[PDB]
Amino acid sequence: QFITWRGIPLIPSNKIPVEDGKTKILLLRVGEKRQGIVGLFQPGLAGEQSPG
Amino acid sequence: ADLYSSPHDQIKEQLRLTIETIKERQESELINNPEYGLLASVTDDQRISTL
């Protein structure tokens, strides 16, 4: 379960640094078809267990 | 080797070039090796000089 604002869910991540009680909040659009954010990986590795 | 191998395999290219160098060295050895080379193997009776 995730809370939403204006229909957009908020996703927790402990990797975002919190210093002196200050932090940052990010808003993202994802996917190639809509000119969004993508991750890149190398397929077909030697001795591959999981992708990349 | 993992990242930069399409459309050419890096390990195979390196091996091919190194083997070419080794074969050239073998050709050099067949002539100039001190103990089994042709120049060392020729006999004084079979050696002659230019006029």
Side-chain angles (χ1 to χ4, degrees), chain A residues 42-46, chain B residues 1-5:
Chain A
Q42 172 71 236
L45 288 174
Chain B
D2 290 332
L3 292 187
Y4 309 118
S5 294

PDB file of all heavy atoms in Angstrom, chain A residues 42-46, chain B residues 1-5:
ATOM      1  N   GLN A  42      23.782  -4.554 -20.132  1.00  0.00           N
ATOM      2  CA  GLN A  42      24.476  -5.307 -21.172  1.00  0.00           C
ATOM      3  C   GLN A  42      24.006  -6.751 -21.169  1.00  0.00           C
ATOM      4  O   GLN A  42      24.210  -7.456 -20.168  1.00  0.00           O
ATOM      5  CB  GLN A  42      25.984  -5.248 -20.958  1.00  0.00           C
ATOM      6  CG  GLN A  42      26.777  -6.165 -21.876  1.00  0.00           C
ATOM      7  CD  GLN A  42      26.773  -5.693 -23.316  1.00  0.00           C
ATOM      8  OE1 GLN A  42      26.389  -6.432 -24.222  1.00  0.00           O
ATOM      9  NE2 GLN A  42      27.203  -4.458 -23.534  1.00  0.00           N
ATOM     10  N   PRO A  43      23.387  -7.237 -22.241  1.00  0.00           N
ATOM     11  CA  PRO A  43      22.947  -8.633 -22.277  1.00  0.00           C
ATOM     12  C   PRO A  43      24.051  -9.576 -22.739  1.00  0.00           C
ATOM     13  O   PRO A  43      25.101  -9.163 -23.236  1.00  0.00           O
ATOM     14  CB  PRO A  43      21.801  -8.598 -23.290  1.00  0.00           C
ATOM     15  CG  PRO A  43      22.249  -7.557 -24.264  1.00  0.00           C
ATOM     16  CD  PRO A  43      22.935  -6.493 -23.429  1.00  0.00           C
ATOM     17  N   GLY A  44      23.785 -10.866 -22.565  1.00  0.00           N
ATOM     18  CA  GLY A  44      24.672 -11.904 -23.071  1.00  0.00           C
ATOM     19  C   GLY A  44      26.050 -11.932 -22.447  1.00  0.00           C
ATOM     20  O   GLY A  44      27.047 -12.111 -23.159  1.00  0.00           O
ATOM     21  N   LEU A  45      26.133 -11.759 -21.131  1.00  0.00           N
ATOM     22  CA  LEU A  45      27.420 -11.809 -20.453  1.00  0.00           C
ATOM     23  C   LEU A  45      27.878 -13.253 -20.266  1.00  0.00           C
ATOM     24  O   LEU A  45      27.068 -14.180 -20.182  1.00  0.00           O
ATOM     25  CB  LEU A  45      27.336 -11.109 -19.098  1.00  0.00           C
ATOM     26  CG  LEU A  45      27.221  -9.585 -19.128  1.00  0.00           C
ATOM     27  CD1 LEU A  45      26.995  -9.036 -17.729  1.00  0.00           C
ATOM     28  CD2 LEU A  45      28.458  -8.964 -19.759  1.00  0.00           C
ATOM     29  N   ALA A  46      29.194 -13.435 -20.205  1.00  0.00           N
ATOM     30  CA  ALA A  46      29.750 -14.754 -19.935  1.00  0.00           C
ATOM     31  C   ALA A  46      29.549 -15.122 -18.470  1.00  0.00           C
ATOM     32  O   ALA A  46      29.838 -14.330 -17.570  1.00  0.00           O
ATOM     33  CB  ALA A  46      31.236 -14.791 -20.290  1.00  0.00           C
TER      34      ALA A  46
ATOM     35  N   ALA B   1      36.375  -7.216 -22.371  1.00  0.00           N
ATOM     36  CA  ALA B   1      35.841  -8.390 -23.054  1.00  0.00           C
ATOM     37  C   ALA B   1      34.323  -8.464 -22.931  1.00  0.00           C
ATOM     38  O   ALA B   1      33.633  -8.834 -23.888  1.00  0.00           O
ATOM     39  CB  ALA B   1      36.486  -9.658 -22.498  1.00  0.00           C
ATOM     40  N   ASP B   2      33.785  -8.122 -21.759  1.00  0.00           N
ATOM     41  CA  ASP B   2      32.342  -8.183 -21.557  1.00  0.00           C
ATOM     42  C   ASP B   2      31.616  -7.104 -22.351  1.00  0.00           C
ATOM     43  O   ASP B   2      30.570  -7.370 -22.954  1.00  0.00           O
ATOM     44  CB  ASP B   2      32.015  -8.047 -20.069  1.00  0.00           C
ATOM     45  CG  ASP B   2      32.421  -9.268 -19.266  1.00  0.00           C
ATOM     46  OD1 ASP B   2      32.449 -10.377 -19.837  1.00  0.00           O
ATOM     47  OD2 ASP B   2      32.709  -9.115 -18.061  1.00  0.00           O
ATOM     48  N   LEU B   3      32.152  -5.883 -22.367  1.00  0.00           N
ATOM     49  CA  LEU B   3      31.385  -4.744 -22.853  1.00  0.00           C
ATOM     50  C   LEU B   3      31.556  -4.468 -24.340  1.00  0.00           C
ATOM     51  O   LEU B   3      30.571  -4.132 -25.007  1.00  0.00           O
ATOM     52  CB  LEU B   3      31.758  -3.485 -22.065  1.00  0.00           C
ATOM     53  CG  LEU B   3      31.335  -3.459 -20.595  1.00  0.00           C
ATOM     54  CD1 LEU B   3      31.601  -2.095 -19.982  1.00  0.00           C
ATOM     55  CD2 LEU B   3      29.869  -3.839 -20.452  1.00  0.00           C
ATOM     56  N   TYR B   4      32.761  -4.598 -24.892  1.00  0.00           N
ATOM     57  CA  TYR B   4      33.039  -4.088 -26.231  1.00  0.00           C
ATOM     58  C   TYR B   4      33.285  -5.205 -27.242  1.00  0.00           C
ATOM     59  O   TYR B   4      34.175  -5.111 -28.089  1.00  0.00           O
ATOM     60  CB  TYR B   4      34.218  -3.120 -26.195  1.00  0.00           C
ATOM     61  CG  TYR B   4      34.077  -2.045 -25.140  1.00  0.00           C
ATOM     62  CD1 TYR B   4      34.990  -1.940 -24.099  1.00  0.00           C
ATOM     63  CD2 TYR B   4      33.024  -1.139 -25.181  1.00  0.00           C
ATOM     64  CE1 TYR B   4      34.862  -0.961 -23.131  1.00  0.00           C
ATOM     65  CE2 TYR B   4      32.888  -0.158 -24.217  1.00  0.00           C
ATOM     66  CZ  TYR B   4      33.808  -0.073 -23.196  1.00  0.00           C
ATOM     67  OH  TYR B   4      33.678   0.903 -22.235  1.00  0.00           O
ATOM     68  N   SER B   5      32.319  -6.119 -27.314  1.00  0.00           N
ATOM     69  CA  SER B   5      32.528  -7.308 -28.181  1.00  0.00           C
ATOM     70  C   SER B   5      31.420  -7.529 -29.216  1.00  0.00           C
ATOM     71  O   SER B   5      31.100  -8.692 -29.480  1.00  0.00           O
ATOM     72  CB  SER B   5      32.758  -8.559 -27.344  1.00  0.00           C
ATOM     73  OG  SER B   5      33.971  -8.458 -26.616  1.00  0.00           O
TER      74      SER B   5
END
